Amino acid sequence: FYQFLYNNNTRQQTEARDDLHCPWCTLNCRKLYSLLKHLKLCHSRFIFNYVYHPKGARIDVSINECYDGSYAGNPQDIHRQPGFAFSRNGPVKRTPITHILVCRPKRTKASMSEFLESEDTYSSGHNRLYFHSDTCLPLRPQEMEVDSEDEKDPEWLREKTITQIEEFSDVNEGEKEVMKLWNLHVMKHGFIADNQMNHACMLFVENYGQKIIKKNLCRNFMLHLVSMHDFNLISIMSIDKAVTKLR
Amino acid sequence: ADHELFLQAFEKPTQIYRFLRTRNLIAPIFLHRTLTYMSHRNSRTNIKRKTFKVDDMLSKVEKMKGEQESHSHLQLTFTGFFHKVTLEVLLVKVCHKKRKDVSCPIRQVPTGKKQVPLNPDLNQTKPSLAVSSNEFEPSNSHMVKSYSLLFRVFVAQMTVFDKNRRLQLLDGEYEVAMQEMQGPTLQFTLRWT
Amino acid sequence: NKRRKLKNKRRRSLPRPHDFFDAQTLDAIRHRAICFNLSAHIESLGKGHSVVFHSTVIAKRKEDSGKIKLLLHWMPEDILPDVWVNESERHQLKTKVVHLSKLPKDTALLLDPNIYRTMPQKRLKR
């Protein structure tokens, strides 16, 4: 007898048409073991159980809630536009993958006394498809390497700090530009040491000394230097270097 | 609750599985006789010791057993058309499909015609014979499928040969139905002069 | 790992991995199956494993003797090559049932192309 159950709320029972025969695949199993083995493998979309009968054999079945129905090929193909998907008309760069599923078949002998009572994955590699973190968009294996998406300093942060500078009223624009260039120089490189602090000095003057002439904000910039020499991050010869670079 | 909704939940899985059975019963994914739990199938062991040069003379044994020949030079005498206008006949040649071509090509020839009266039932006249040479050739049938004949007053078809290398027709009398664009029909008999 | 048990050792409850099939294709397959049963009657008459062939005669053939023959023909038009039968075995061949395993090679695609599709469908490349 075949039992179909929906949370026991609604249920239907039918009677087998001949024994040891598959209702769906129509296979004459000729063994209840070959039958039950056929049931799980062939009808994987469902679940199956043995509940015994007054005659001796009764089967109750239900849907596989965790059924593994999904596309198995290259994941990048699913999200392509229709027509472009399932092309298979040219070589496709795809990430390497490897799976191991059979190390040795157990080949245990059939035994119903144990089987009815019981009834009563070596993967390797980047399997799943990854997405662009910045924009929530699918990646492609082609650019799967260079995609740091991360660096010393994001652009929007540069915008926000510049805007916050203008809020200050006590600062003349001659000074305001000074730290804009100097700060934007900082998180561009992220110096953290006093030695780097000095090295940043000839570095910053080297890159933007001409721009200092262009803005003609030199005198404010020397004073901005003197503060660090007051903060011990600058030596006198360092100040001399800026003069030489400027001129 | 209602079993109709319960059936509706399970309808698609069963419908999918019914189609899956049909294709596998035609194009299986695996050999069921190789199943361990289906061990009664293919119970015979593999006797790899069996030699294969024996297949050489065994092939000759069946070949002289299966020697074939054909009559020679088709002939057929006309008989009155029956219906409640002359009639024409055509012969076609069917060829196997090759790698490049998408559908198997077919070639047709206008074998002949006859001036059949307007539905002559009985006592129409006082016969005429259609002469066919050895157009069919076993060597040609090696490269193309068997030929066939067409009849038009109105379409009808009748094939001469089969892939079993055995002729389908014989020198008896024939009366084929005649379909347009019981009912219209033409009669005749086959000869081998 | 020597103590590696079966593949079931994964999880208790996780989000569904999304089903690859679709609805509109499901209905088309069903109706294709439905119209398939309207002529082949696999589900209704063949019990899901057989097809019914009803015999019809195209031509009547009489030899010199009393072995008058008929050329039996079946409606699906994808059936086996057409054969000559006599008058005596008319009227019970009017319902022929053939198992799926006994169908000819070409009939596999004649009944339904979707039974097997040559996916390239053309010579894009070797």
Binding site: Q12, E15 | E11 | -
Partner: peptide
Amino acid sequence: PPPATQISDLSKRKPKTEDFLTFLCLRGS
């Protein structure tokens, strides 16, 4: 549904329209 007729419930469930066959599938409605 009270009559657990046969396995025919499959033949009852699928052809709900378009000339339901066997004329007896209505019993296991």
